[PDB]
Design an enzyme around this catalytic site. Structure first.
Site, PDB file in Angstrom:
ATOM      1  N   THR A  30      35.689  12.486  22.071  1.00 12.65           N
ATOM      2  CA  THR A  30      36.081  13.366  23.159  1.00 12.65           C
ATOM      3  C   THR A  30      36.231  12.593  24.464  1.00 12.65           C
ATOM      4  O   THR A  30      35.786  11.450  24.594  1.00 12.65           O
ATOM      5  CB  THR A  30      35.060  14.492  23.335  1.00 12.65           C
ATOM      6  OG1 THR A  30      33.737  13.941  23.367  1.00 12.65           O
ATOM      7  CG2 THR A  30      35.168  15.483  22.186  1.00 12.65           C
ATOM      8  N   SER A  31      36.882  13.244  25.428  1.00 14.23           N
ATOM      9  CA  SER A  31      37.037  12.692  26.767  1.00 14.23           C
ATOM     10  C   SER A  31      35.678  12.338  27.358  1.00 14.23           C
ATOM     11  O   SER A  31      34.752  13.154  27.348  1.00 14.23           O
ATOM     12  CB  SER A  31      37.758  13.700  27.666  1.00 14.23           C
ATOM     13  OG  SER A  31      37.934  13.183  28.975  1.00 14.23           O
ATOM     14  N   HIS A  89      32.508   5.092  23.721  1.00 10.15           N
ATOM     15  CA  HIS A  89      31.649   5.570  22.652  1.00 10.15           C
ATOM     16  C   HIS A  89      31.154   4.376  21.844  1.00 10.15           C
ATOM     17  O   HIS A  89      31.741   3.291  21.871  1.00 10.15           O
ATOM     18  CB  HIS A  89      32.407   6.546  21.753  1.00 10.15           C
ATOM     19  CG  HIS A  89      32.560   7.915  22.338  1.00 10.15           C
ATOM     20  ND1 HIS A  89      33.777   8.557  22.415  1.00 10.15           N
ATOM     21  CD2 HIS A  89      31.652   8.766  22.873  1.00 10.15           C
ATOM     22  CE1 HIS A  89      33.614   9.743  22.974  1.00 10.15           C
ATOM     23  NE2 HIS A  89      32.333   9.895  23.261  1.00 10.15           N
ATOM     24  N   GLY A  90      30.059   4.571  21.118  1.00  9.28           N
ATOM     25  CA  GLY A  90      29.461   3.452  20.420  1.00  9.28           C
ATOM     26  C   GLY A  90      28.603   3.865  19.251  1.00  9.28           C
ATOM     27  O   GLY A  90      28.071   4.978  19.199  1.00  9.28           O
ATOM     28  N   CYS A 131      26.564   4.494  23.020  1.00 10.08           N
ATOM     29  CA  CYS A 131      25.520   4.859  22.076  1.00 10.08           C
ATOM     30  C   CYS A 131      25.331   3.749  21.049  1.00 10.08           C
ATOM     31  O   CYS A 131      26.260   3.004  20.727  1.00 10.08           O
ATOM     32  CB  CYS A 131      25.866   6.173  21.373  1.00 10.08           C
ATOM     33  SG  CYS A 131      25.937   7.612  22.461  1.00 10.08           S
TER      34      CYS A 131
END
EC number: 3.4.22.56
Lengths: 142, 93, 5
Positions: A30-31, A89-90, A131
């Site tokens: 997501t954004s 993100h991660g 993350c």
């Protein structure tokens, strides 16, 4: 050598900010709202640190690899250090281009001692806002 | 000779295997606290000393806030991973 | 509000 890294080079070095906020919906990501404040916070913070900042926005996983191959294949000989800021993100060891995952070891290995010899014995920093899993730290009281 | 993996420093927003939080209005807890401490102590503190105050900031000054009860009142501790071989100061001589 | 990465 010294007790501290030599920072009195001509330049402090390159500060690469990789800010991926919007992701393809084929990924389910997501954004990332609020990341523009982070990337713009980092540009200023390192602008006062006399760094040559380069903000790079919504890069695909292949664009992340090839940029770091180009940055690592540079003559850092006149630069004190290399800063790299990833914002995405991660997972653990995994960073996300806007179309899929990268391996954190893919990116960093471009800058090793035997690969980026312009940056050998020179502090290579990597700031990763992402993350690393899905475990919740609930805290504790003192 | 030196190893091929020395002088690498990895600042992580969250502990290994955990969630990393970010505010929808202000930005991520980590980059927030990192920029504040970098702007405040790069004149006087060694880098690893700046990076631990960033840890005290995210750990204590921050807590999650969510309408989803599953993601509410959660904490975050950063993670420094230093393969550096000397100290790092952003001022000169 | 706060969100996870």
């Amino acid at each position: 050598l010294d007790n501290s890294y030599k920072m009195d080079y001509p330049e402090m070095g390159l500060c690469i900010i990789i800010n991926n906020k919007n992701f393809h919906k084929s990924t389910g990501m997501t954004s990332r709202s609020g990341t523009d404040v982070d990337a713009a916070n980092l540009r200023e913070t390192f602008r006062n640190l006399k760094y040559e900042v380069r903000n790079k926005n919504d890069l695909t996983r292949e664009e992340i690899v090839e940029l770091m191959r180009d940055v690592s294949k540079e003559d850092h000989s006149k630069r004190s250090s290399f800063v790299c800021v990833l914002l995405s993100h991660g997972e653990e060891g995994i960073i996300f281009g806007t179309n899929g995952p990268v391996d954190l070891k893919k990116i960093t290995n471009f800058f090793r001692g035997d690969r980026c010899r312009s940056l050998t014995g020179k502090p290579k920093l990597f700031i990763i806002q992402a993350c690393r899993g899905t475990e919740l730290d609930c805290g504790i009281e003192t | 000779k030196i190893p091929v993996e020395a002088d690498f420093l990895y600042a992580y927003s969250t502990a290994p295997g955990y969630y990393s939080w970010r505010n929808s209005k202000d930005g991520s807890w980590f980059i927030q606290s990192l920029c504040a401490m970098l702007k405040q102590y790069a004149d006087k503190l060694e880098f690893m000393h700046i990076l631990t105050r960033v840890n005290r900031k995210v750990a204590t000054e921050f807590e999650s806030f969510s309408f989803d009860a599953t993601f509410h009142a959660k904490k975050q501790i950063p993670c420094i991973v230093s393969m550096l071989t000397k100290e790092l100061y952003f001022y000169h001589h | 509000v706060d969100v996870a990465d």
